[PDB]
């Protein structure tokens, strides 16, 4: 039993084989080197190499061709898969059949559009995928297009200071099964400032208090350990009836997943 990865994550017992990938993908091979053990390795501080790994895994394991810039966040695939499988568990996906269409929202989808591409590819899930950043929007839209998934994934550029509520008016589906979200990167006064991550997820909580049963589950993936406790307390204060959380990692890269619901 793994403590780092979701039980159904394909990389849980089959980690990426860099020698295999280098043998097959010349664009990947040019970014690898040999370590002191004589093993094929990669410099994870180098964005070109990290990009090549992500693009290569998506191609090899998921049949997805993506194009992304060096100047925006490059996602790490094994880590992201944990969140997809966790959402599967939240919504009861393992125990239903294909006749049930699911509808998600990815808040701040990124240049990769990685959550919608994985969810649409693996499960046939629909996504509304929002993005404030122009470059990320443009890339996301092309990545969905080039993988022929625009009937499942609607990529939408949204204004700088809007979130879930603004995205879901008369245009919307009646009920969504979930939202997902990776938050964006961010001796005198005793009180610590909330910081970017806590503030951002509190905005989602605030929107959920309006939308209530229009989404079955609200979720986020947290990058700061210190986020989880205050967000649980804010959900308690507001009387949110169903709260669940879990923890994943990939090596030293740790994440805390938090989800809540107004259903019984
Ligand atoms: Na494969």
Residue numbers in the entry: 3 to 188, 214 to 291
Share the article's original sentences.
In this work, we present the structural analysis of human METTL16 based on two X-ray crystal structures of the N-terminal MTase domain (residues 1–291) of human METTL16 (METTL16_291): an apo form at 1.9 Å resolution and a post-catalytic complex with S-adenosylhomocysteine (SAH) at 2.1 Å resolution. To provide structural insights into the methyltransferase reaction catalyzed by the MTase domain of METTL16, we solved X-ray crystal structures of apo and SAH-bound METTL16_291 (METTL16_291/SAH). These structures confirmed that METTL16 is a Class I SAM-MTase that uses a conserved Rossmann fold to bind the SAH product and likely SAM, the methyl-donor substrate. The conserved SAM-MTase core (residues 79–288) of METTL16_291 possesses a mostly parallel, seven-stranded β sheet (β1–β7) organized as ‘3214576’, with β7 being antiparallel. Although the MTase domain of METTL16 has a canonical Class I MTase structure, METTL16_291 has several unique structural regions: residues 1–78 that precede the Rossmann fold as well as residues 95–97 (ηZ) and 188–222 (a putative loop containing disordered residues 188–214) within the Rossmann fold.
